[PDB]
Amino acid sequence: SLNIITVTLNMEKYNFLGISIVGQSERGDGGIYIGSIMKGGAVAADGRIEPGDMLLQVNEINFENMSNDDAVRVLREIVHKPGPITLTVAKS
Ligand SMILES: O=C(O)c1cc(Br)ccc1NS(=O)(=O)Cc1ccccc1
Ligand SMILES: O=C(O)c1cc(Br)ccc1NS(=O)(=O)Cc1ccccc1
């Protein structure tokens, strides 16, 4: 059953998300997943996003039908800039 949440991290007290991502989307097949979360990042601090959650959107960028390589580069660009980061995930 679909369980999709949108989480805003203010990135004030944290210098990175602290996630690894695996997989990519065949239309409707696979997806980009949170592989691991490290303590001391913004994602661990919030605690709602877990390994096995599917990454759907970050800020104004959709991650459905994005390659894993492209997803890593987009995330680096966003985390290396100041401001809040809004992640939309599908819970496992
Ligand atoms: O080892 C890397 O190149 C790496 C790059 C990114 Br971007 C994120 C994590 C990476 N290493 S890892 O083996 O997955 C360990 C880890 C996992 C989450 C956050 C930071 C490091
Ligand atoms: O901040 C992250 O977790 C991150 C994840 C991915 Br996938 C790609 C880039 C990321 N941010 S980053 O600052 O460019 C590299 C990083 C990744 C994990 C921990 C600390 C730094």
Coordinates of N, CA, C and O and ligand atoms in Angstrom, one line a residue:
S1 N 0.9 -1.2 0.0 CA 0.0 0.0 0.0 C 0.9 1.3 0.0 O 1.9 1.3 0.7
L2 N 0.5 2.3 -0.8 CA 1.2 3.5 -1.0 C 1.4 4.3 0.4 O 0.3 4.5 1.0
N3 N 2.6 4.6 0.8 CA 2.9 5.4 2.0 C 3.9 6.5 1.7 O 5.1 6.2 1.8
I4 N 3.5 7.6 1.2 CA 4.4 8.7 0.6 C 4.4 9.9 1.6 O 3.3 10.3 2.0
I5 N 5.5 10.3 2.0 CA 5.7 11.5 2.9 C 6.7 12.5 2.3 O 7.6 12.1 1.6
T6 N 6.4 13.8 2.5 CA 7.3 14.9 2.1 C 7.9 15.5 3.4 O 7.1 15.9 4.3
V7 N 9.2 15.5 3.5 CA 10.0 15.8 4.8 C 10.9 17.0 4.4 O 11.6 16.9 3.4
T8 N 10.8 18.1 5.2 CA 11.6 19.3 5.0 C 12.7 19.3 6.1 O 12.4 19.3 7.3
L9 N 14.0 19.3 5.7 CA 15.2 19.5 6.5 C 15.8 20.9 6.4 O 16.0 21.2 5.2
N10 N 15.9 21.6 7.4 CA 16.2 23.1 7.4 C 17.7 23.3 7.1 O 18.1 24.4 6.7
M11 N 18.5 22.2 7.2 CA 20.0 22.2 6.9 C 20.6 23.4 7.5 O 21.6 24.0 7.0
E12 N 20.3 23.7 8.8 CA 20.9 24.8 9.6 C 22.0 24.3 10.5 O 23.1 24.9 10.6
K13 N 21.8 23.1 11.1 CA 22.7 22.5 12.1 C 23.4 21.3 11.5 O 24.2 20.7 12.2
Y14 N 23.2 21.0 10.2 CA 23.7 19.8 9.5 C 24.3 20.2 8.2 O 23.8 21.1 7.5
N15 N 25.4 19.6 7.8 CA 26.3 20.0 6.6 C 26.0 19.0 5.5 O 26.6 19.3 4.4
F16 N 25.2 18.0 5.7 CA 24.9 17.0 4.6 C 23.7 16.2 5.1 O 23.3 16.2 6.2
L17 N 23.1 15.4 4.1 CA 21.9 14.5 4.3 C 22.4 13.3 5.1 O 21.7 12.9 6.1
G18 N 23.5 12.7 4.6 CA 24.1 11.5 5.2 C 23.4 10.2 4.7 O 23.1 9.3 5.5
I19 N 23.2 10.1 3.4 CA 22.5 9.0 2.7 C 23.4 8.4 1.6 O 24.2 9.2 1.0
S20 N 23.3 7.1 1.3 CA 23.7 6.5 0.0 C 22.4 6.1 -0.7 O 21.4 5.8 0.0
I21 N 22.5 6.1 -2.0 CA 21.3 5.7 -2.9 C 21.7 4.6 -3.8 O 22.9 4.5 -4.2
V22 N 20.8 3.6 -4.1 CA 21.1 2.4 -4.9 C 19.9 2.3 -5.9 O 18.8 2.8 -5.5
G23 N 20.1 1.7 -7.0 CA 19.0 1.4 -8.0 C 18.7 2.6 -8.9 O 19.3 3.7 -8.7
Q24 N 17.9 2.4 -10.0 CA 17.3 3.4 -10.8 C 16.0 2.8 -11.4 O 15.9 1.6 -11.4
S25 N 15.1 3.7 -11.9 CA 13.9 3.3 -12.7 C 14.4 2.9 -14.1 O 15.3 3.6 -14.7
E26 N 13.4 1.0 -16.7 CA 12.0 0.5 -17.2 C 10.9 1.3 -16.5 O 10.9 1.3 -15.2
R27 N 10.1 2.0 -17.2 CA 9.0 2.8 -16.7 C 8.1 2.0 -15.8 O 7.5 1.0 -16.3
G28 N 8.0 2.3 -14.5 CA 7.2 1.6 -13.4 C 8.0 0.5 -12.8 O 7.5 0.0 -11.7
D29 N 9.2 0.2 -13.3 CA 10.1 -0.9 -12.7 C 11.2 -0.2 -11.9 O 11.6 0.9 -12.3
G30 N 11.7 -0.9 -10.9 CA 12.8 -0.4 -10.0 C 12.5 0.9 -9.4 O 11.4 1.2 -9.0
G31 N 13.6 1.7 -9.3 CA 13.5 3.0 -8.6 C 14.8 3.4 -7.9 O 15.7 2.5 -7.8
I32 N 15.0 4.6 -7.4 CA 16.1 5.0 -6.6 C 15.7 4.9 -5.1 O 14.7 5.5 -4.7
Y33 N 16.5 4.1 -4.3 CA 16.2 3.8 -2.9 C 17.3 4.3 -2.0 O 18.5 4.4 -2.5
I34 N 17.0 4.7 -0.8 CA 18.0 4.9 0.3 C 18.6 3.6 0.7 O 17.9 2.7 1.1
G35 N 19.9 3.4 0.4 CA 20.7 2.2 0.7 C 21.1 2.2 2.2 O 21.0 1.1 2.8
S36 N 21.5 3.3 2.7 CA 22.0 3.5 4.1 C 21.9 4.9 4.5 O 21.9 5.8 3.6
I37 N 21.8 5.1 5.8 CA 21.8 6.5 6.5 C 22.8 6.5 7.6 O 22.8 5.5 8.4
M38 N 23.7 7.5 7.6 CA 24.8 7.6 8.6 C 24.3 8.6 9.7 O 23.6 9.6 9.4
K39 N 24.5 8.2 11.0 CA 24.3 9.1 12.1 C 25.1 10.4 11.9 O 26.3 10.3 11.4
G40 N 24.6 11.6 12.3 CA 25.2 12.9 12.3 C 24.9 13.7 11.1 O 25.3 14.9 11.0
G41 N 24.0 13.1 10.2 CA 23.5 13.8 9.0 C 22.1 14.3 9.3 O 21.5 13.9 10.4
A42 N 21.5 15.2 8.5 CA 20.2 15.8 8.6 C 19.1 14.7 8.6 O 18.1 14.9 9.3
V43 N 19.2 13.7 7.8 CA 18.2 12.6 7.5 C 18.1 11.8 8.8 O 16.9 11.6 9.3
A44 N 19.2 11.4 9.4 CA 19.2 10.6 10.7 C 18.6 11.5 11.8 O 17.8 10.9 12.6
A45 N 18.9 12.8 11.8 CA 18.4 13.7 12.9 C 16.9 13.8 12.9 O 16.3 13.8 14.0
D46 N 16.3 13.8 11.7 CA 14.8 13.9 11.5 C 14.2 12.5 11.8 O 13.1 12.5 12.5
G47 N 14.7 11.5 11.2 CA 14.5 10.1 11.7 C 13.4 9.4 10.9 O 13.1 8.2 11.2
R48 N 12.6 10.1 10.1 CA 11.4 9.6 9.4 C 11.8 8.8 8.2 O 11.0 7.9 7.8
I49 N 12.8 9.2 7.5 CA 13.3 8.5 6.3 C 14.3 7.4 6.7 O 15.1 7.6 7.6
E50 N 14.1 6.2 6.1 CA 14.8 5.0 6.5 C 15.4 4.3 5.3 O 14.9 4.5 4.2
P51 N 16.4 3.4 5.5 CA 16.9 2.6 4.4 C 15.7 1.8 3.8 O 14.9 1.3 4.5
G52 N 15.6 1.7 2.5 CA 14.6 1.0 1.7 C 13.5 1.9 1.3 O 12.7 1.5 0.4
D53 N 13.4 3.1 1.8 CA 12.5 4.2 1.3 C 13.0 4.6 -0.2 O 14.2 4.5 -0.5
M54 N 12.0 4.8 -1.1 CA 12.2 5.1 -2.5 C 12.2 6.7 -2.6 O 11.2 7.3 -2.1
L55 N 13.2 7.2 -3.2 CA 13.4 8.7 -3.4 C 12.6 9.1 -4.6 O 12.9 8.6 -5.7
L56 N 11.6 10.0 -4.5 CA 10.7 10.4 -5.6 C 11.0 11.8 -6.0 O 10.9 12.0 -7.3
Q57 N 11.3 12.7 -5.1 CA 11.5 14.2 -5.4 C 12.4 14.8 -4.4 O 12.2 14.5 -3.2
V58 N 13.3 15.7 -4.8 CA 14.1 16.6 -3.9 C 13.9 18.0 -4.4 O 14.2 18.2 -5.6
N59 N 13.4 18.9 -3.6 CA 13.1 20.3 -3.9 C 12.2 20.2 -5.2 O 11.1 19.6 -5.1
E60 N 12.6 20.8 -6.3 CA 11.7 20.9 -7.5 C 12.2 19.9 -8.6 O 11.7 20.0 -9.7
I61 N 13.0 18.9 -8.2 CA 13.6 17.9 -9.1 C 12.9 16.5 -8.8 O 13.1 16.0 -7.7
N62 N 12.3 15.9 -9.8 CA 11.7 14.6 -9.7 C 12.8 13.5 -10.0 O 13.5 13.7 -11.0
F63 N 12.8 12.4 -9.2 CA 13.9 11.4 -9.2 C 13.3 10.1 -9.8 O 14.1 9.1 -9.8
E64 N 12.1 10.1 -10.2 CA 11.5 9.0 -11.0 C 11.9 9.1 -12.5 O 11.6 10.2 -13.0
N65 N 12.6 8.2 -13.0 CA 13.1 8.2 -14.4 C 14.4 9.0 -14.4 O 14.7 9.6 -15.5
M66 N 15.2 9.0 -13.3 CA 16.6 9.6 -13.3 C 17.5 8.4 -13.0 O 17.2 7.5 -12.2
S67 N 18.7 8.4 -13.7 CA 19.8 7.4 -13.5 C 20.4 7.7 -12.1 O 20.3 8.8 -11.6
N68 N 21.0 6.6 -11.5 CA 21.6 6.7 -10.2 C 22.8 7.7 -10.3 O 22.8 8.5 -9.4
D69 N 23.5 7.7 -11.3 CA 24.7 8.6 -11.6 C 24.2 10.1 -11.5 O 24.8 10.9 -10.8
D70 N 23.1 10.3 -12.2 CA 22.5 11.7 -12.3 C 21.9 12.1 -11.0 O 22.2 13.3 -10.6
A71 N 21.3 11.2 -10.2 CA 20.7 11.4 -8.9 C 21.8 11.9 -7.9 O 21.6 12.8 -7.2
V72 N 23.0 11.2 -7.9 CA 24.1 11.5 -7.0 C 24.6 12.9 -7.3 O 24.9 13.7 -6.3
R73 N 24.7 13.3 -8.6 CA 25.2 14.6 -9.0 C 24.2 15.7 -8.6 O 24.7 16.8 -8.1
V74 N 22.9 15.5 -8.8 CA 21.9 16.5 -8.4 C 21.9 16.7 -6.9 O 21.8 17.9 -6.5
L75 N 22.0 15.6 -6.1 CA 22.0 15.7 -4.6 C 23.2 16.4 -4.1 O 23.1 17.3 -3.3
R76 N 24.4 16.2 -4.7 CA 25.7 16.9 -4.3 C 25.4 18.4 -4.6 O 25.8 19.2 -3.7
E77 N 24.9 18.8 -5.7 CA 24.6 20.2 -6.1 C 23.7 20.9 -5.1 O 24.0 22.1 -4.8
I78 N 22.7 20.2 -4.6 CA 21.7 20.7 -3.7 C 22.3 20.9 -2.3 O 22.1 21.9 -1.6
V79 N 23.0 19.8 -1.8 CA 23.6 19.8 -0.4 C 24.7 20.8 -0.3 O 24.9 21.3 0.8
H80 N 25.4 21.1 -1.4 CA 26.6 22.0 -1.4 C 26.1 23.5 -1.4 O 27.0 24.4 -1.3
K81 N 24.8 23.7 -1.6 CA 24.2 25.0 -1.5 C 23.5 25.2 -0.2 O 23.0 24.2 0.3
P82 N 23.4 26.4 0.4 CA 22.6 26.7 1.6 C 21.1 26.5 1.3 O 20.7 26.6 0.1
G83 N 20.3 26.4 2.3 CA 18.8 26.4 2.3 C 18.2 25.1 2.7 O 18.9 24.1 2.7
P84 N 16.9 25.1 3.0 CA 16.2 23.8 3.4 C 16.1 22.8 2.2 O 16.1 23.3 1.0
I85 N 16.1 21.5 2.5 CA 16.0 20.4 1.5 C 14.7 19.7 1.8 O 14.5 19.2 2.9
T86 N 13.8 19.6 0.8 CA 12.5 18.9 0.9 C 12.6 17.6 0.1 O 12.8 17.7 -1.1
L87 N 12.5 16.4 0.8 CA 12.5 15.1 0.2 C 11.1 14.5 0.3 O 10.5 14.5 1.4
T88 N 10.7 13.9 -0.9 CA 9.4 13.1 -0.9 C 9.9 11.7 -1.2 O 10.7 11.4 -2.1
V89 N 9.5 10.7 -0.3 CA 9.8 9.3 -0.4 C 8.6 8.4 -0.3 O 7.6 8.9 0.3
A90 N 8.6 7.3 -0.9 CA 7.7 6.2 -0.7 C 8.2 5.2 0.4 O 9.3 4.7 0.1
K91 N 7.6 5.1 1.5 CA 8.0 4.2 2.7 C 7.9 2.8 2.2 O 7.0 2.4 1.4
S92 N 8.8 1.9 2.7 CA 8.9 0.5 2.4 C 7.7 -0.2 3.1 O 7.1 0.3 4.1
Ligands
LIG1 O1 32.0 6.1 -0.6 C1 31.4 7.0 -1.3 O2 31.9 7.5 -2.4 C2 30.1 7.6 -0.9 C3 29.5 8.6 -1.6 C4 28.3 9.2 -1.2 BR1 27.7 10.7 -2.2 C5 27.6 8.6 -0.1 C6 28.2 7.5 0.6 C7 29.4 7.0 0.2 N1 30.0 6.0 0.9 S1 29.2 4.7 1.6 O3 30.1 3.6 1.3 O4 27.9 4.6 0.9 C8 29.1 5.1 3.3 C9 28.3 6.4 3.6 C10 26.9 6.2 3.8 C11 26.1 7.4 4.0 C12 26.7 8.6 4.1 C13 28.1 8.7 3.9 C14 28.9 7.6 3.7
LIG2 O1 24.6 14.7 1.7 C1 24.5 13.6 1.3 O2 24.1 12.6 2.0 C2 24.8 13.3 -0.2 C3 24.2 12.2 -0.8 C4 24.5 11.9 -2.1 BR1 23.8 10.3 -2.9 C5 25.2 12.8 -2.9 C6 25.7 14.0 -2.3 C7 25.5 14.2 -0.9 N1 26.0 15.3 -0.3 S1 27.6 15.8 -0.4 O3 27.8 16.8 0.6 O4 27.8 16.2 -1.8 C8 28.6 14.3 -0.1 C9 28.3 13.7 1.3 C10 27.6 12.5 1.4 C11 27.4 11.9 2.6 C12 27.9 12.5 3.8 C13 28.7 13.7 3.7 C14 28.9 14.3 2.4

